[PDB]
């Protein structure tokens, strides 16, 4: 069926649970052994979250290459991401190494630091632009540029330097401040305008490595992230733009990391999204 006419018949029919739990049991389960391994505990934020073996992103290091992240490759679209878990006080490190060593252009940041009186990642990043970070464990040093504070989001100007190089990169860090801490937004458009701000910065194009996205697991409000992006690129390439099954597209890339979209509210939020956002790119 098409998207916005489905979409009302789920309204009207009240079946959202219905059709969220038929995706949970479609699902891929792939194996997850090396995030499994005990000296990885301190690495995973979650238990039950984890990258699958074939997807996961390796660190270039020999003692231990594990970070909880995978690589999510959209063939027919021609997009990549890295979805990975808010960092952790024992891995920011590991973070930076990751950006670094994947040649990535932006973060995009979906959750606070606090939310619901508790933490859900670590400061990861300088506040103040004379109070650099240097993070020792990976060699790397962090430094404040800019920082441009709207009323949804705010945007970064970073610089990574590798300190055994002394090469420098520009990472752009894409923060989107105000998701409620319950439930999801009632409009998409704040979201939208802020997809749209990350893809006319340059992050999420080919000359680049893939963007890391995050929120505190990495599954659910990163998900509604990278599925509204492909969706709506899916739509401007194909000759018959309703051929586009945001289903089917989920399903996909849920064979690249376990769980994405948490609830039914995010999976009619992620419609809404993709619905609105296709009438904003043409007219
Ligand atoms: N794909 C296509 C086929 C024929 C004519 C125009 C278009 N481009 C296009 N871009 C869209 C983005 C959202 C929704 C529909 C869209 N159609």
Same mark, same amino acid.
Do not use: M
């Given at each position: 069926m098409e998207m916005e006419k489905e979409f009302e018949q789920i309204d009207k029919s009240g079946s959202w649970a219905a059709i969220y739990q038929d995706i949970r049991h479609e699902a891929s389960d792939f194996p997850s052994r090396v995030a499994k391994?005990? @000296?990885? @505990?301190?690495?995973?934020?979650?238990? /039950?979250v984890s990258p699958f073996d074939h997807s996961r992103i390796k660190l270039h290091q020999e003692d231990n290459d594990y970070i909880n992240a995978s690589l999510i490759k959209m063939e027919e679209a021609q997009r990549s991401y890295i979805l990975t878990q808010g960092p952790l006080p024992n891995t920011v490190g590991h973070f930076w190494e990751m950006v670094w060593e994947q040649k990535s252009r932006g973060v995009v940041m979906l959750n606070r630091v606090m939310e619901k009186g508790s933490? @859900?990642?670590?400061?990861?990043?300088?506040?103040?632009?004379?109070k650099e970070m240097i993070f020792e464990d990976t060699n790397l040093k962090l430094t404040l540029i800019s920082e441009d504070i709207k009323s949804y989001y705010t945007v970064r100007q970073l610089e990574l330097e590798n300190l055994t190089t002394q090469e420098t990169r520009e990472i752009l860090h894409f923060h989107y401040?105000?998701?409620? /801490?319950? %439930?999801?937004?009632?409009?998409?458009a704040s979201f939208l305008n802020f997809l749209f701000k990350v893809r006319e910065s340059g992050?999420?194009?080919?000359?680049? %490595?893939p963007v890391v996205v995050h929120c505190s697991?990495?599954? %659910?409000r990163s998900g509604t992230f990278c599925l509204a992006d492909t969706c709506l690129l899916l739509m401007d390439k194909r @000759?018959?733009?309703?051929?586009?099954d945001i289903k089917k597209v989920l399903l996909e890339m849920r064979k690249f990391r376990m769980?994405?979209?948490?609830t039914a509210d995010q999976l009619r939020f992620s419609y809404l999204a993709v619905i609105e956002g296709a009438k904003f790119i043409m007219g």
């Open positions: 391994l005990p @000296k990885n @505990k301190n690495r995973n934020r979650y238990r /039950d933490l @859900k990642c670590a400061q990861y990043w300088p506040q103040k632009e004379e401040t105000t998701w409620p /801490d319950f %439930g999801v937004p009632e409009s998409p992050s999420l194009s080919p000359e680049h %490595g697991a990495g599954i %659910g @000759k018959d733009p309703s051929s586009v769980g994405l979209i948490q």
